Write a protein that binds this ligand. Structure first.
Ligand SMILES: Nc1nc2c(ncn2[C@@H]2O[C@H](COP(=O)(O)OP(=O)(O)OP(=O)(O)O)[C@@H](O)[C@H]2O)c(=O)[nH]1
Ligand SMILES: Nc1nc2c(ncn2[C@@H]2O[C@H](COP(=O)(O)OP(=O)(O)OP(=O)(O)O)[C@@H](O)[C@H]2O)c(=O)[nH]1
Ligand SMILES: Nc1nc2c(ncn2[C@@H]2O[C@H](COP(=O)(O)OP(=O)(O)O)[C@@H](O)[C@H]2O)c(=O)[nH]1
Ligand SMILES: Nc1nc2c(ncn2[C@@H]2O[C@H](COP(=O)(O)OP(=O)(O)O)[C@@H](O)[C@H]2O)c(=O)[nH]1
Ligand SMILES: [Mg+2]
Lengths: 48, 426, 429, 430, 427
């Protein structure tokens, strides 16, 4: 029967150890606590 | 041609070496079906160290799986890269030790050691110049703790001049996994003193600490800890399987890390572990590898290295790396921290470089450190045994199987003997 | 091969076993007729062409509870002559199930154990299910566990015994039956797991918010615990615990082998939507005293040994953090010579849910079995009930005429007297 | 991650709790079923997949108000175990809520709080809601407030208490219960933000111009005050404030911790288009006495410490410009020893509008929560009412039967003499 | 090879220090991603002053952002140019001081200042030569005051040969943003006198009338306020990162502007402040720069320079300028009104020219003034602190965390010492 993270979505430590891919400009955003820090809302407006 | 025979012991050993061959075969470019799919001839340049050529290009490891219950036989067979092993190396029991060190060593280990010793004798004779034997097991259990240490005593008598690499996990201090850990560990360490050439101490709670703080993994699974062990198991044999500007095999490390024959326990770690968030922003250079090398948070042992003096140290750098930049930063860490290195051995740190790095990484390094701080693990394991032994609890299981209580009394005496020997050199 | 044989003795054995194999066939996909539409070998032996039969015997002296299984929906699951019946009841008589009518029925039992043991390749242990207050459970269980000890030496025998409650005893001669049963189970059974029918009543009333529970709803909760202890065999995990792993790591002394029981998440369907069930929250619920399945208070005692069986999607990273947070709590106490008091077992399959059962779908679950010094409270109390009854020889004339003479009462009284002296010295600092 | 655990005791708290949690689900967009169609995380804990339960307990000895929430529009919102009921109510008796009935329910009440404490990582504080004139509002809260202080050290508590008006009140022993509750909230509650029942009636009649309001209408603009002060914790702002920021900013002395409250824009939907709602107009309306949530004339007293909670499209200069204009006005008077008297908390979110509510959609809003020396006028009239009650020991025989003793009446009276004399000397110039 | 470490503290520090990193990243030419996109090769000459080389050519700032409240780093990462900072430098707390100096300095700082000196030390020996440290925090608050000044004290003990800039914002004169501002201002001054090598003061109402009367914008927001705060700090280090005719490093800004070690507090002013509707009428000549630079309205502190003389003045010119007109204008202003200058230092004014102007503008200047008129900013806070303390107001919050009134008496004793010695040298 499959383990926890095989059904969570993140599989193995290949990407984070071999340092392939990239969190920014990429697809994988499921691993790192800095990445799942959501943070407050954004109300953007350029400086006048 | 300097080949290594792998022995995997018990629940911990069979799971560690499952991911260990899952990484090394990927490092050498081996697909799940055991054939070859690589691109550089350097990968196939030294495969006799770990693999055997078979008919049709099949690559089978020299790994002997040994355990007392058949539960882990399906666990490694149905896993990823789980079919690469020869079936004659699947020597297994049926009853299970049940965390009974006496059962793995005396009662049911007797009818299984004579079977696993035939397989090791089969694999050792087929290969030409044995660099040594690698064993992986646990110290808190009964199958890899008891029957694993019985294999060490038998294999040392048969091959006394060969080298034993003992890979052991130690019971964690802050968290307990089995109640009988003081009985299992203090007994298993004692035969590791006279028989094992060198031992490489691992610890689970240090591996949990590394994943949560350094790698910043939200969920570190049971195999993520296993993956970090395999990254350092593959680093010890970096110079064997690959060329290098400065070569350092197993025996060159052992003579430079063992000043006295009973002080052969090491604390180890892997340098270039950066989190996914801090992945881009790290300028991967030699100063980064050194400042993470001697960080106490990067160690994979329960003992803080700042507590006890480093007796000897070893570094195995990997990558196209400047040999001066290695050397001028070994001197930097020795001079900036003078009290943590022992005085009566000049030039404690020993460094070597392997020209090819692991896949996807450009600069990497693995560590071995023979420190006198590891008595903190040794003293703590022993004092749990002394509190256990004076009440004689959890002992009727042990003494009902062929151990009188006196054989335990040499166990803490030898355990107190090493903490006496570590005490005088610090 | 990992292969275990469970025996069910007494009325409580049959009803627990009926709810047990109800959950076991649903776990492995076995239909009630036995036709599967690799891991079944722990409890089901494959027979002929695609049919599985339980590795159990339902032996009892009441014919009414045995043929209820025969006339029920599981007529095609169990073997016909593995459901052993009896002509005449023991009828709350320990001496009757030991000497009078227990003799002619134990020979048929040993034949079916031998036939089942030769069928299994490597036997892993024995599971027994009884209530010590009844005549059949105490009497025949004294004789049956005696015979398996001689026949099957040094083999693990797991005991799931139900004891009379402090407040409630649904029979009058239960202090006689319970004390005289403990004379036999002390030397022979390897691990006994204490259960009380009225502590499970408190669990069902509060956790499952059922004001009117019955014996079937009690036995659903028991079947979940037995499955959780044996799920390590049937399915893999990061840390899997054999039943042979279980005895040696939790029994410190030969005459101390009684265990507590705890199952952490007991949540109905309505409450399961809102409760955030994670590892750190449930490990506090497991050591919570109202979730303990016997009516001994662990605050009064000291935890001597403790085993944790974790089911479901349990990562191993937080179980180390969860155990350490328990050890930092002052209310949970440990004996001074055992700083290492935990055995954590992790299994990857979630517990199944029966259709119509009170328990709901839960992602992660914890089964805790522990050894504590508070077990002297349930043994000194039943000592007081038996000593008060033996002051003027109440209900003794029934026991004397059925073979068991007057010495066995004094002998079993002295055995439990040493047992009461045994718990007070192991907790001594 | 920070969280706040609101506490509501008494049926006044539950009806406010029905109104306050109505806006929190509406502002964050939570449907009554409890699903999302980290802003919720300061009030709602995630359970499983896309589900939110309130970090609150509704403990009350009266079961009719508690199960009304259990059968209302939010049946699947609240955790049924977090809603704690009682078999019989205290019924305007502090003795029944503190000693006899209260003791067998606070053991279950603190268990839920302990279960709530482990779920949240960093707990910012507790918001306590009760009516000091009620039995369980005074009794059960006082037993609960002292148990929280001995359990969680120094953690912030916000007393959002409902006081009876000296001119209008709806029970005869509210002076007894308010006096006895005040004895407990001085030593425990960090900030006691005051609310008057009759004062907000005048706001609905005049400013909100609805001539027939009910308690559902009255609780909503109270609930709009509660969200505005905590929205800075909820949402980003130019100058954010916190729960923990508020106590050390508005309480100079450890036994003067009472706050008056004012919400600036109170206009109807038809009035909303015609009003030029503006930063100068709302701030000038904030200091206007009829906009106060408590029936006070601040000309008689003086403003010691003040606090501005700005929501919406507010630029930094005019809120600072409104600071200068108030200080130039001789109508608004400050005590001479606190020149820095304003805290400006600006939030970028305009307040939400409740469907069917009397309040209109507005862009800018101000929540004034200011300590003042005019609060002693409330406690003097309550003490004057207490003096007539205790002059002949009327309504005392109920209290002495249920555990309480005669001497507790004198000791609670002794504190209000010390509280009243402390209000005068602090406001006294020196 | 001079490296400057930037330190931000608290709600004000992490928000307005972000915009300082906005303008430098916009002026050195790096994108929000982190790569170089500048036109000239002059920008890449000195990148090491503020940024670290990394993998893929990305430049990560030498900045550690630190506070006790988690709300700011939600805003810091979400804003533009927010991805560039290293997350290892993003050390934060969980409680939050809440405008209290005692919680930041002693109670809740003690478990975190040991963490922030691990992060600072990692970026300390990473670079070659520390020129010093710059910090921009708040004095009216508590998460950047108490937590900040303890860091400022600790780094001077560890690294005593390096230099300190404190771009500290003070409470506004006419309006107050927090009630307990006079306590946290005076307790921060008592620590910043002996630890900070120099201090530059910014005041919000001094920014408010500038952004309205001179910049002719009806509603500037806080981002408009922080821009001139961000613009002046880039004018501090203009001569470091870029070549010029005459170079003034940041040690020059210390050794020249500061006659005595206690008299180190400054005031700052950005010179070319013309609106969008008034720029094309104005001729961009260095006489027009020098008249605006010496104007009282252009200063970003609460003081008025007609009240007190300048002990020492400075000017950080940026662009291609004729240095004769630069020299003779400062000579003229020294000769037009010798009363407004301190007499006993001849030629009080320093000028240094950076050859490249900032983006868009072609001629700019940055005035640094160690004027004795800024004692009014000290005195008005000092009289507020005496009045608040004499009734022991708001004191049980402070003394309950490990404070006693001995430091408060000592904090006043250095507070009124400054206004006494600043007035003494004016005479
Ligand atoms: N766990 C559990 N216990 C039960 C159940 N039903 C009855 N019991 C317990 O069993 C006790 C009755 O004694 P038993 O051992 O069942 O009696 P018996 O097995 O029929 O033995 P004899 O009557 O002598 O033939 C009661 O006191 C109950 O506590 C059940 O369904 N589950
Ligand atoms: N503002 C406001 N005040 C309320 C509301 N409901 C009740 N009150 C006030 O509360 C007073 C009664 O005190 P409570 O605490 O609610 O009485 P209780 O909770 O029933 O106390 P017990 O009788 O002991 O159960 C009334 O006089 C009202 O003025 C409400 O919804 N809004
Ligand atoms: N690092 C690591 N440790 C393990 C692994 N498996 C088991 N352990 C550790 O081994 C100890 C118990 O070993 P055990 O399961 O009893 O081995 P056994 O004797 O073969 O059954 C525990 O402390 C575990 O933390 C593994 O795959 N990796
Ligand atoms: N220019 C500017 N000043 C600010 C900003 N935020 C706060 N301040 C100043 O800082 C003081 C309040 O800061 P505060 O938030 O309490 O600091 P902290 O809580 O300790 O981090 C006020 O006097 C403001 O003048 C901002 O965004 N821009
Ligand atoms: Mg009520």
């Amino acid at each position: 029967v499959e383990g926890p993270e095989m059904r969570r979505g993140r599989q193995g430590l290949y990407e984070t150890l071999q340092q392939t891919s990239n969190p920014y400009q990429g697809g994988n955003k499921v691993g790192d606590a800095w990445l799942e820090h959501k943070g407050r809302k954004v109300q953007p407006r350029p400086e006048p | 041609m300097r080949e290594i025979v792998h022995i995997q012991g018990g629940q911990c050993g069979n799971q560690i070496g499952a991911k260990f061959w899952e990484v090394v075969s990927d490092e050498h470019g081996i697909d799940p079906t055991g054939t070859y799919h690589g691109d550089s001839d350097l990968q196939l340049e030294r495969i006799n160290v770990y693999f055997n050529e078979a008919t049709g290009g099949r690559y089978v490891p020299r790994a002997i799986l040994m355990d007392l219950e058949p539960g882990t036989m399906d666990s490694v067979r149905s896993g990823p890269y789980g079919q690469i092993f020869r079936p004659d190396n699947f020597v297994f029991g049926q009853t299970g030790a049940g965390n009974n060190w006496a059962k793995g060593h005396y009662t049911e280990g007797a009818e299984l050691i004579d079977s696993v010793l035939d397989v090791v004798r089969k694999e050792a004779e087929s290969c030409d110049c044995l660099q040594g034997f690698q064993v992986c097991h646990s110290l808190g259990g009964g199958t890899g703790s008891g029957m694993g240490t019985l294999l060490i005593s038998k294999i040392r008598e048969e091959y006394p001049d060969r080298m034993m690499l003992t890979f052991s996990v130690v019971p964690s201090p802050k968290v307990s996994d089995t109640v009988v850990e003081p009985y299992n560990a203090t007994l298993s360490v004692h035969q590791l003193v006279e028989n094992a050439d060198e031992c490489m101490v691992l610890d689970n709670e240090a591996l949990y600490d590394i994943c949560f703080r350094t790698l910043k993994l939200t969920t570190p699974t049971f195999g993520d800890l296993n993956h970090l062990i395999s990254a350092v198991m593959s680093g010890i044999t970096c110079c064997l399987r690959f060329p290098g500007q400065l070569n350092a095999d197993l025996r060159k490390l052992a003579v430079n890390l063992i000043p006295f024959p009973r002080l052969h326990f090491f604390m180890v770690g892997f340098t270039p572990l950066t989190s996914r968030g801090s992945q881009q922003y790290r300028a991967l250079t030699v100063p980064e590898l050194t400042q993470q090398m001697w960080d106490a948070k990067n160690m994979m042992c329960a003992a803080d290295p700042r507590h006890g003096r480093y007796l000897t140290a070893s570094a195995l750098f990997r990558g196209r790396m400047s040999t001066k930049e290695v050397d001028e930063q070994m001197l930097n860490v020795q001079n900036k921290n003078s009290s943590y290195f022992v005085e009566w051995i000049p030039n404690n740190v020993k460094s070597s470089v392997c020209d090819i790095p692991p896949k996807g990484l450009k600069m990497s390094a693995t560590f071995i450190g023979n420190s006198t701080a590891i008595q903190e693990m040794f003293k703590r394991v022993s004092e749990q045994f002394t509190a256990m032994f004076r009440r004689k609890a959890f002992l009727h299981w042990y003494t009902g199987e062929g151990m009188d209580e006196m054989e335990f009394t040499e166990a803490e005496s030898n355990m107190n003997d090493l903490v006496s020997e570590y005490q005088q050199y610090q | 091969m990992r292969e275990v044989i469970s025996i069910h003795i007494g009325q409580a054995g049959i009803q627990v076993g009926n709810a047990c194999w109800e959950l076991y066939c649903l776990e492995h996909g076995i239909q009630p007729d036995g036709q599967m539409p690799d891991a079944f070998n722990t409890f089901f032996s494959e027979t002929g062409a695609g049919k599985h039969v339980p590795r159990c015997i339902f032996l009892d002296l009441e014919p009414t509870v045995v043929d209820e299984v025969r006339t029920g929906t599981y007529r095609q699951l169990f073997h016909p002559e593995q459901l052993i019946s009896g002509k005449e009841d023991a009828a709350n008589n320990f001496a009757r199930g030991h000497y009078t009518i227990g003799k002619e029925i134990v020979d048929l039992a040993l034949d079916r154990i031998r036939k089942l043991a030769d069928n299994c390749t490597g036997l892993q242990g024995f599971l027994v299910f009884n209530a010590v207050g009844g005549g059949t459970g105490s009497g025949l269980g004294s004789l049956l566990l005696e015979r398996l000890s001689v026949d099957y030496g040094k083999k693990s025998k797991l005991g799931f015994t139900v004891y009379p409650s402090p407040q409630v005893s649904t029979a009058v001669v239960e202090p006689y039956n319970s004390v005289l049963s403990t004379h036999s189970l002390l030397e022979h059974t390897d691990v006994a797991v204490m259960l009380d029918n009225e502590a499970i009543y408190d669990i069902c009333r509060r956790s499952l918010d059922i004001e009117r529970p019955t014996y079937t709803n009690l036995n659903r909760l028991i079947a979940q615990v037995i499955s959780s202890l044996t799920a390590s065999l049937r399915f893999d995990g990061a840390l899997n615990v054999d039943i042979t792993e279980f005895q040696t790591n939790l029994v410190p002394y030969p005459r101390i082998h009684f265990m507590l029981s705890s199952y952490a998440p007991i949540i109905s369907a309505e409450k399961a939507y809102h409760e955030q069930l994670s590892v750190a929250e449930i490990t506090n619920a497991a050591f919570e005293p109202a979730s303990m399945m016997v009516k001994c208070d662990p605050r009064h005692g000291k935890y001597m040994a403790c085993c944790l069986m974790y089911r479901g999607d349990v990562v191993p990273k937080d179980v180390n953090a969860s155990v350490a947070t328990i050890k930092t709590k002052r209310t949970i106490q440990f004996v001074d010579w055992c700083p290492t008091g935990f055995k954590c077992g992790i299994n990857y399959q979630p517990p199944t849910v029966v259709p119509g059962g009170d328990l709901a779908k839960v992602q992660r679950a914890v089964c805790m079995i522990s050894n504590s010094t508070a077990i002297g409270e349930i043994f000194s109390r039943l000592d007081h009930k038996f000593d008060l009854m033996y002051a003027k020889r109440a209900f003794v004339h029934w026991y004397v005429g059925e073979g068991m003479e007057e010495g066995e009462f004094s002998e079993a009284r002295e055995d439990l007297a040493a047992l009461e002296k045994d718990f007070e010295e192991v907790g001594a600092e």
